[PDB]
Write a protein that binds this ligand. Structure first.
Ligand SMILES: COCC(CCO[C@H]1CC[C@@]2(C)C(=CC[C@H]3[C@@H]4C[C@@H]5O[C@]6(CC[C@@H](C)CO6)[C@@H](C)[C@@H]5[C@@]4(C)CC[C@@H]32)C1)COC
Ligand SMILES: COCC(CCO[C@H]1CC[C@@]2(C)C(=CC[C@H]3[C@@H]4C[C@@H]5O[C@]6(CC[C@@H](C)CO6)[C@@H](C)[C@@H]5[C@@]4(C)CC[C@@H]32)C1)COC
Ligand SMILES: CCCCCCCCCC(=O)OC[C@H](COP(=O)([O-])OC[C@H](N)C(=O)O)OC(=O)CCCCCCCCC
Ligand SMILES: CC(C)CCC[C@@H](C)[C@H]1CC[C@H]2[C@@H]3CC=C4C[C@@H](OC(=O)CCC(=O)O)CC[C@]4(C)[C@H]3CC[C@]12C
Ligand SMILES: COCc1nn2c(CN3C[C@@H](CC(F)(F)Cl)CC3=O)c(C(F)(F)F)nc2s1
Ligand SMILES: CCC(=O)OC[C@H](COP(=O)(O)OCC[N+](C)(C)C)OC(=O)CC
Ligand SMILES: *[C@@H]1O[C@H](CO)[C@@H](O)[C@H](O)[C@H]1NC(C)=O
Ligand SMILES: *[C@@H]1O[C@H](CO)[C@@H](O)[C@H](O)[C@H]1NC(C)=O
Ligand SMILES: *[C@@H]1O[C@H](CO)[C@@H](O)[C@H](O)[C@H]1NC(C)=O
Length: 574
């Protein structure tokens, strides 16, 4: 029966073992996670393209990928469940192709709506791709080390995070390119960035063609000749490199059992949430939602908090110039953080000036000349402009809030605010994301090195405990750099939890409801990511415990309720 089939397959993979083929597959399928990390970045951190490039302090957006996450929630449901009926390589290839097409295609649109509609489908693809990776590499390993050799794969998610962060603060260090983007090469670097991205997926898609399909899938459908060749192929591949190329595959025999393919996928996914696998899934869903919500919320809450603290340190410097009587001033030095409520400007000359955070609430502008005057967040509210000659200044006929002119004549247009030393905030959030992924190296290393030396049920509990402790420690370190250290710690501590959970999820599910489950759970993780990136980011200037307590409580409830899951070490793959 199926038990004997699984026993025979485990003996087979123990005969073959590891070598020149498992490493190749780990490097290939890794590139399909690399692209998932790149997309997670493009969706959570490279979203601010709506931030007004002409204004600073502008708040981030919630559309670039808040809707692309819903894309990864529909691709995990369909493409992740369509694998157990069509294959784990066929649908993985389709997913990666959708992503690489509608990603490299988004580098040509002339607007944000088309860019959004393209990144949506790219996310669909990659989110359908992720689960199939773990349900496809989990069929070439051996029960002895299914946890270690399956946890290293997370090294590629981190790798895509680094790739995207670096190629972003190196290509798109600015914001405000989602403003009816044109088709040219003027400040059009997001195109070169989107092209640099999709390279991991574009390399996996072509490297996937050279890879065989999962035998167990070809062994459950009811055919052998299409599988016994793969097994022979893997044995030869791992023996040629090793010192025994003369060993021949000993096993010879083995035992085995439109508008309709989606009905089968539904009847399959429904068997995962009701009947058998209802208790193991109703808990894995909880743990997954908790993990993902917490992680995404907290990794979006850190850099935003860095920027909030930077602003607050910049805000205290606001030097209210309620004074007046400025006479004969050839002013040419930058004028930052000033609000002249009641000022009397007479015969003044702001020449070669840069206005940043300069407000005027009630000014009798008797006379003043303006030249090469640039503005970022300037505003003249209830002013009184008597005789001012604005020449070669910024185009800011809108900053004049409710006040008219008498002797004015404007001869300026087509100027940019700074396009420098202000978007360093986006450079900073990209660098924070980089340093946060770069800290997952020790976490994933120790995870893969210990996931087999000890259980997978206690690693989850320990990692979630330490993440909750880090969270509760964040309530004290309200600094601008300590937040980065706490991010590094929380990340390097959380990675192990996701590894253990991927292991426990490749177990607990037969080979027919493995990718389906994985896909539903990835969709739940993406919904939790939506909730996190929409909740935590909405508490950067309102509260500091609400999101922290949410994340800590979610992690504790996902780590202590996960202990209700069994130990899956000696259990066969099935
Ligand atoms: C101040 O602004 C500077 C900027 C120009 C700087 O450009 C450089 C920035 C570093 C960057 C992006 C560059 C090329 C190779 C990139 C590396 C390739 C490696 O690939 C990786 C990931 C994939 C792995 C397989 C191998 O290692 C990374 C570790 C390594 C990498 C991604 C780190 C970042 C590197 C270009 C101009 O800004 C407007
Ligand atoms: C195979 O049989 C052994 C197995 C247990 C596995 O133990 C491993 C731990 C030590 C060691 C030497 C082994 C392989 C990968 C090695 C890692 C590769 C990564 O490369 C680096 C280099 C720097 C970065 C560029 C990437 O990461 C290091 C951080 C990481 C590394 C060098 C740390 C040391 C690891 C074996 C169970 O069998 C009894
Ligand atoms: C090809 C490729 O990507 O590199 C493969 C290379 C070899 O992996 P390896 O170093 O683990 O040797 C495999 C050996 N047969 C075993 O059973 O462990 O792994 C590398 O270290 C490179
Ligand atoms: C629940 C009990 C009975 C079992 C203990 C399980 C351990 C295997 C867990 C618990 C704490 C976990 C550690 C929590 C913190 C880290 C730090 C982490 O390092 C980092 O990447 C962040 C450090 C930094 O850059 O600041 C590496 C993984 C590690 C050792 C974790 C490895 C797995 C550990 C030891
Ligand atoms: C969300 O979708 C469902 C899955 N995501 N996911 C990932 C990707 N991770 C792991 C975490 C990276 C951290 F270090 F910050 Cl904790 C957050 C994240 O996005 C992996 C991994 F390969 F990393 F092990 N396994 C699965 S299942
Ligand atoms: C991949 C190495 C790489 O990342 O190269 C970095 C450069 C920097 O971006 P850029 O300034 O060329 O962006 C285009 C700006 N524009 C359109 C106004 C000229 O990006 C590249 O040129 C990579 C080809
Ligand atoms: C500003 O003007 C003063 C004289 O009014 C001059 O000494 C100084 O060099 C000028 N600085 C700049 C940056 O133009
Ligand atoms: C501007 O402020 C002054 C000071 O209170 C007030 O007298 C005047 O009516 C205000 N004008 C407008 C247009 O608000
Ligand atoms: C300002 O406008 C008034 C009204 O037209 C005019 O009499 C006066 O000459 C103008 N002065 C300047 C400096 O433009």
């Amino acid at each position: 029966d199926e038990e004997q089939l699984a026993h025979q397959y485990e003996t087979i993979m123990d005969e073959c073992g590891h070598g020149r083929f498992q490493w190749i597959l780990f490097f290939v399928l890794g590139l399909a996670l690399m692209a998932d990390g790149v997309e997670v970045f493009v969706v959570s951190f490279a979203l601010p393209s709506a931030e007004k490039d002409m204004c600073l302090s502008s708040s981030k957006k919630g559309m670039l990928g808040m809707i692309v996450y819903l894309g990864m929630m529909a691709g995990a449901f369909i493409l992740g469940g369509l694998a157990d009926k069509l294959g784990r390589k066929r649908v993985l290839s389709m997913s990666l192709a959708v992503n690489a097409s509608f990603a490299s295609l988004s580098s040509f649109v002339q607007g944000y709506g088309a860019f959004l509609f393209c990144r949506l489908i790219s996310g669909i693809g990659i989110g359908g791709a992720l689960p199939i990776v773990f349900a496809y590499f989990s069929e070439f390993l051996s029960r002895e080390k299914r946890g270690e050799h399956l946890s290293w794969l997370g090294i590629f998610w981190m790798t895509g995070g680094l790739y995207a962060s670096a190629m972003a603060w190196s290509i798109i260090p600015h914001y405000g390119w989602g403003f009816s983007m044109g088709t040219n090469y003027h400040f059009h670097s997001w195109r070169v960035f989107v092209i640099v991205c999709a390279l991991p997926c574009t390399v996996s898609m072509v490297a996937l063609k050279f890879m065989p399909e999962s035998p167990r899938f070809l062994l459950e459908m009811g055919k052998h000749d299409e599988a016994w060749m793969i097994l022979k192929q893997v044995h030869d591949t791992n023996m040629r490199a090793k010192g025994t190329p003369e060993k021949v595959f000993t096993v010879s025999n083995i035992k085995t059992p439109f508008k309709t393919i989606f009905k089968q996928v539904w009847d399959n996914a429904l068997y995962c949430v009701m009947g058998p696998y209802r208790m193991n899934t109703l808990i894995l869903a909880v743990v997954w939602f908790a993990m993902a919500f917490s992680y995404y919320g907290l990794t979006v809450w850190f850099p935003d908090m860095i920027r909030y603290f930077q602003d607050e340190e910049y805000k205290s410097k606001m030097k209210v110039f309620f004074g007046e009587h400025v006479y004969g001033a050839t002013i040419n030095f930058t004028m930052e953080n000033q609000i002249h409520q009641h000022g009397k400007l007479v015969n003044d000359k702001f020449t070669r000036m840069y206005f940043k955070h300069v407000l005027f609430e009630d000014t009798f502008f008797d006379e003043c000349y303006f030249e090469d005057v640039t503005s970022t967040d300037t505003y003249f509210k209830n002013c009184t402009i008597e005789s001012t000659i604005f020449y070669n200044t910024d185009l800011y006929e809108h900053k004049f809030i409710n006040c008219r002119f008498i002797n004015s004549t404007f001869l300026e247009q087509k100027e940019g605010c700074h396009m420098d030393l202000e978007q360093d905030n986006d450079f900073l959030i990209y660098l924070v994301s980089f340093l946060g992924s770069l800290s997952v190296l020790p976490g994933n290393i120790i995870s893969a090195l210990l996931m087999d030396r000890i259980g997978r049920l206690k690693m989850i509990g320990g990692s979630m405990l330490i993440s909750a402790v880090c969270c509760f420690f964040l309530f004290f370190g309200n600094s601008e750099s300590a937040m980065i250290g706490w991010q590094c710690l929380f990340c390097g501590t959380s990675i192990a939890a996701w590894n253990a959970l991927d292991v426990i999820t490749v177990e607990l599910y037969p080979t027919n409801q493995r990718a389906t489950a994985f896909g539903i759970l990835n969709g739940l993780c993406k919904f939790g990511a939506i909730l996190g990136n929409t909740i935590f980011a909405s508490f950067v200037g309102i509260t500091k415990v609400v999101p922290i307590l949410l994340a800590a409580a979610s992690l504790v409830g996902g780590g202590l309720i996960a202990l209700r899951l069994p130990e899956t070490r000696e259990q066969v793959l099935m």
